[PDB]
Amino acid sequence: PKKPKEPVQVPKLLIKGGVEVLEVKTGVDAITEVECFLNPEMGDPDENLRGFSLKLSAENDFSSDSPERKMLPCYSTARIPLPNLNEDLTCGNLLMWEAVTVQTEVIGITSMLNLHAGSQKVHEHGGGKPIQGSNFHFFAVGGEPLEMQGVLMNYRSKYPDGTITPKNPTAQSQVMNTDHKAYLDKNNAYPVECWVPDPSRNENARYFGTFTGGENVPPVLHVTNTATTVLLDEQGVGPLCKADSLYVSAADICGLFTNSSGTQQWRGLARYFKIRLRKRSVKNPYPISFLLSDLINRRTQRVDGQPMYGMESQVEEVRVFDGTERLPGDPDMIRYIDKQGQ
Amino acid sequence: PKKPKEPVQVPKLLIKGGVEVLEVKTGVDAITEVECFLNPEMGDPDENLRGFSLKLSAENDFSSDSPERKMLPCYSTARIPLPNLNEDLTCGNLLMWEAVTVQTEVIGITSMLNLHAGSQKVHEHGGGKPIQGSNFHFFAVGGEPLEMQGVLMNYRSKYPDGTITPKNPTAQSQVMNTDHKAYLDKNNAYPVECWVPDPSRNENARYFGTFTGGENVPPVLHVTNTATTVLLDEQGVGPLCKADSLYVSAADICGLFTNSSGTQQWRGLARYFKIRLRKRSVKNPYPISFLLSDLINRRTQRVDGQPMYGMESQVEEVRVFDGTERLPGDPDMIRYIDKQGQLQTKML
Amino acid sequence: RRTQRVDGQPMYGMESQVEEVRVFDGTERLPGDPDMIRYIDKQGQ
């Protein structure tokens, strides 16, 4: 027998629970943990094919694809409004969220070890067969609504609409045509195979996913409940719920569910999030001025002038100037040589 | 809470946006984020086999091989012109770019989840057989318009060259051939299977690729966007695009789309790259003379007549006089310099 | 001049399969913005 010690001063965590916790404002950056989930979006056909796409075709052809929503998982979003960190200020170092850790996960395996209600039979005397046939687990969350870049190949493909697919087909669309740039601002809109990050246009989202080819791929899961993911970086900063409104993203192709005739349809599933949060300081740059200017713009119309900047030029001129030069030899200097022989 | 907490004395972006930025004035470290990307070169049959190759042969022979371009990816390359730090620069310290981070990524798969559209019905009431196979995603980044090194089997082949293959067709061309040394200095021309690093020379390029042989071989990604790879080393360097022009280099075989006919043909896809650049300062490393020789003589004529030059010499002797000294009693010596000291040899 | 020369892809100007440069140097006491703004043609439209 030996002696007993401590407990500690505890950053309170009276606050507790689900969605309720949002409700207020609290003592400095205290910090909080959040349990939610967002469900799947397979573009599904059913409520039996809940967490599943519709069974699939094998072929069609380039020229000939146009599905319907039902085999078309689109991203699972929800935009999550968090209460403030920001409300009667002007200026100063203001606060955005930097939410510190999350574990979130595509949730729901154990039942799919059933192949004895059938699945599709493996063969032999052998029972059903699982689900599997490539899988993607991915998510990205960002404090921004997500700039996508749609990618098709086969721009002689077709598909519907709210199945917001990469928009504007070209040969180039097959290796993306500049367009197809989108914004995640609709729970399940962008069928996942159609949209791709306009990623470096999404700094303030962090994505990770692996799409996991082969052609049946045995999956593996790891419920070692301890990985912690910190929502930071090299500076130790994550995405910012700048807008304390959150664009949450994932795709988690659980695999292909082998509907009984080898009809396969995806199983994709719901995601969970357990979100460890903190109140973070930035520096207002949002002040009055910006409003003022804001103001004027509404206050205006929008006249159809004529266009002379960017791609519409008839303005010919951007140069900086600069304070009293001495007397260089010349002021025209090639800062990239242009080799063509050289 | 919200709060005027000391809000990080973060760096200073000044502007960003593409190409326009280059033109800029000077600001020491200076450093930059390149969000580029390259489209693939597959032998790209067309606008649909735009980013994909032509299909391929199946049981053959060296002998039974003439290539033609379409199936032939060659590596994708570029001179990216890079700013000149040195336009004015006149100091005895020299600035150069030294190359700091890339997080690049082969980009935009998502259509390729078609088990549909001609994806050879594997069977069942399940789907197709889409793409896949081996994949090689690779890139090399050079500072240089690099040393390639050609690799051929099959010098019973009948190869193209727009898809500039290596030349030379010894047995030894089938193993190393020290002559199939080349140099990538060409968009879609080194067909990939044909060419290999002359890595003995590749020292001022960094490449990373992992060629991933195998029948269908799965693509397992990662889509992080949250940790670069850094282009430094012991001496903190990557390629040296000494070249303020950029040698860009790549191959990204996604695998092969398998048509319903098993028309299999490589599929390649574009890579995005995200580069971090700084200004590194050096010494002089090379002298005036070595330079001078140029201007001068270059904006000039040649003089050579009866032959002297070389060795064809109505030239006569090259020796060393010099000094005035007592009397070595061999003085019609043969006076040398072993090189480091004086060799003094004769027959007398 | 002395250099050898090549063909590749056009990564600049119009013909750029590059996308972007993001100028750094200096510092600053961390604003709010996780981007840049300037004109109300940046910010506005």
Swiss-Prot record, chain A:
Q: Name one GO cellular component term.
A: host cell nucleus
InterPro entries per record: Capsid_VP1_Polyomavir, dsDNA_vir_gr_I_capsid, Polyomavir_VP1_sf
Q: Which keywords describe this protein according to UniProt? A: Capsid protein, Caveolin-mediated endocytosis of virus by host, Disulfide bond, Host nucleus, Host-virus interaction, Late protein, Phosphoprotein, T=7 icosahedral capsid protein, Viral attachment to host cell, Viral penetration into host cytoplasm, Virion, Virus endocytosis by host, Virus entry into host cell
**Gene Ontology BP term (one):** caveolin-mediated endocytosis of virus by host cell
Q: Cross-referenced Gene3D superfamilies, in alphabetical order?
A: Capsid protein VP1,Polyomavirus (2.60.175.10)
Q: Which residues carry this modification: Phosphothreonine?
A: T324
Q: Which is an annotated GO molecular function term of this record? A: structural molecule activity
Subunit comment? Homomultimer; disulfide-linked. The virus capsid is composed of 72 icosahedral units, each one composed of five disulfide-linked copies of VP1. Interacts with minor capsid proteins VP2 and VP3.
What is recorded about the domains? Answer: A DNA-binding domain overlapping a bipartite nuclear localization signal is present in the N-terminal region of the protein and is required for efficient virus formation.
What function is annotated for this protein? Forms an icosahedral capsid with a T=7 symmetry and a 50 nm diameter. The capsid is composed of 72 pentamers linked to each other by disulfide bonds and associated with VP2 or VP3 proteins. Interacts with gangliosides GT1b and GD1b containing terminal alpha(2-8)-linked sialic acids on the cell surface to provide virion attachment to target cell. This attachment induces virion internalization predominantly through caveolin-mediated endocytosis and traffics to the endoplasmic reticulum.
- Return the protein name: Major capsid protein VP1
